[PDB]
């Protein structure tokens, strides 16, 4: 019926490529927003920078919940479109929007009365805390807008419409890029201006999504209350992927906070700065993997809805092969142009001291990017078949047990310093990727048996 549905129901390799690319583009613009924003805020001085840092974990928590619900929505929709179960996909989509309201507004009313004492309960004091509270208040006010935007994106990706999913990301992040200097500097609102810029850009994104869903009504799925039937099976289907997805993203954040502590132990404050920089650069080259993982979930889901294991395996292994080849080019570039990249991320007189260490990190750490596709696409298809708990276990094994465990081991038992941290992270990721790939094969051979 729609071009996206025909993509999903067609050749898996074409769908994989045509769904992943617009997702990579969308995530690249989001990445550009964050980098630009970091530049604006850094020129406001330490108080504003500390206010943002204070609020960082709460913000990541909100994103984890919003994105989690979006992934469970996308997977459930994709599977029912595969089964030619149209009324099921309609009902999943409606259940997801009601869930967006419940989750989004719950976040707002739970965190609004808690935020003043919460940020005071930390060690910090003075202006930075006051700014952090005001900053958080603005974003918590749009918690529903955030969740709704992620659920809408999931509905689009769920029905093979990555182009509009991309567009909404581009619109939101692009608008935030325009509003940032206007709100912070031109209107003189300072750091809280960035919060308002974001809130406004999220609201506008909401309008486009709502317009498509409720006015144009040109999606494959139909969203009406008349054909909404309260279903505990649908709720459980969405949450079996969504909730473990949120926990995975939190396992990621928890690992970063642990690795911060490992980095300060190995190289001091400046070593934390090296880790933070090298990690941002590394997470740049992981963007195509995320885009290809989002596509895998949709195509493996639809293939699983068709009860077509051959199509599922083809999509899965092809995503790995392509992600692998991209990462090779990505890793080669980073290791080759390490000094040039390190220049751009040490763009100040004060960050000049950590440049040499950043180069070494860039000639060691990014190597794991080439093994990541084996574990990530495996996690992606676990979500496609609805088994989120398997994806959670695999991600906990990679981020917490293997990444942090091996980094901690090198710092405790050796004198390698920061180099041991990178090597520990690479070894940790290598192991998990192999374990993940083999678990994936087991699960697939079982699928053929059933």
């Amino acid at each position: 019926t729609t071009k996206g549905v025909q993509l999903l129901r067609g050749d898996p390799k074409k769908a994989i490529v045509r769904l992943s690319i617009p997702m990579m583009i969308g995530m690249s613009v989001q990445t550009l927003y964050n980098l630009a924003d970091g530049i604006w805020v850094s020129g406001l001085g330490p108080e504003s920078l500390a206010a943002v840092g204070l609020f960082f974990p709460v913000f990541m928590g909100i994103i984890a919940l919003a994105a989690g619900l979006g992934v469970g929505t996308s997977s459930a929709i994709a599977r029912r479109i595969g089964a030619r179960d149209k009324e099921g996909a309609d009902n999943v989509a409606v259940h997801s929007l009601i869930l967006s309201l419940i989750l989004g507004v719950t976040i707002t009313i739970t965190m609004l009365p808690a935020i003043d004492s919460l940020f005071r309960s930390m060690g910090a004091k003075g202006e930075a805390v006051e700014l952090a509270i005001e900053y958080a208040r603005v974003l918590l006010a749009g918690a529903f807008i955030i969740v709704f935007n992620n659920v809408g994106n999931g509905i689009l990706r769920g029905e093979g419409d990555a182009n509009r999913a991309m567009l909404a990301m581009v619109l939101g992040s692009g608008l935030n890029i325009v509003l940032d200097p206007i709100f912070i500097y031109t209107l003189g609102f300072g750091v809280v201006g960035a919060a308002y810029a974001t809130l406004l850009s999220m609201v506008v994104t909401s309008l486009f999504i709502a317009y498509w869903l409720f006015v144009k009504r040109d999606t494959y799925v139909d969203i009406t209350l008349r054909d909404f039937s309260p279903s505990r099976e649908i709720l459980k289907d969405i949450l079996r992927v969504g909730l473990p997805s949120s926990l995975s993203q939190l396992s990621m954040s928890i690992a970063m906070f642990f690795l911060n502590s490992v980095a300060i132990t190995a190289g001091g404050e400046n070593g934390v700065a090296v880790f933070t920089s090298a990690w941002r650069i590394t997470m740049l080259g992981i963007v195509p993997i995320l885009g290809m993982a989002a596509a895998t979930t949709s195509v493996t889901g639809a293939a699983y809805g068709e009860r077509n294991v051959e199509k599922l395996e083809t999509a899965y292994l092809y995503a790995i092969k392509i992600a692998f080849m991209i990462e090779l080019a990505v890793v080669a570039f980073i290791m080759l142009f390490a000094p040039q990249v390190a220049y751009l991320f040490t763009y100040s007189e004060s960050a000049q001291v950590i440049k040499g260490d950043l180069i070494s990190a860039l000639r060691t750490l990014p190597v794991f990017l080439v093994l990541t596709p084996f574990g990530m696409m495996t996690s992606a298809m676990f979500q496609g078949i609805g088994e989120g708990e398997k994806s959670l276990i695999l991600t906990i094994f990679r981020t917490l047990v293997m990444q942090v465990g091996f980094a901690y081991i090198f710092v405790h038992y050796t004198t390698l310093g920061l180099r041991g941290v990178w090597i520990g992270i690479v070894i940790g990721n290598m192991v998990a990727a192999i374990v993940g790939f083999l678990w994936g094969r087991m699960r697939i051979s079982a699928l053929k048996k059933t």
Binding site: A50, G53, M122, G123, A128, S261, V272
Partner: peptide, 19 residues
């Protein structure tokens, strides 16, 4: 243990185990 501490001068959070 577990502690979760913020460095206002580094703008980053730290997670430590008992120790």
């Amino acid at each position: 243990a577990f502690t979760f501490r913020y460095s206002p001068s580094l703008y980053t959070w730290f997670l430590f185990p008992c120790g």
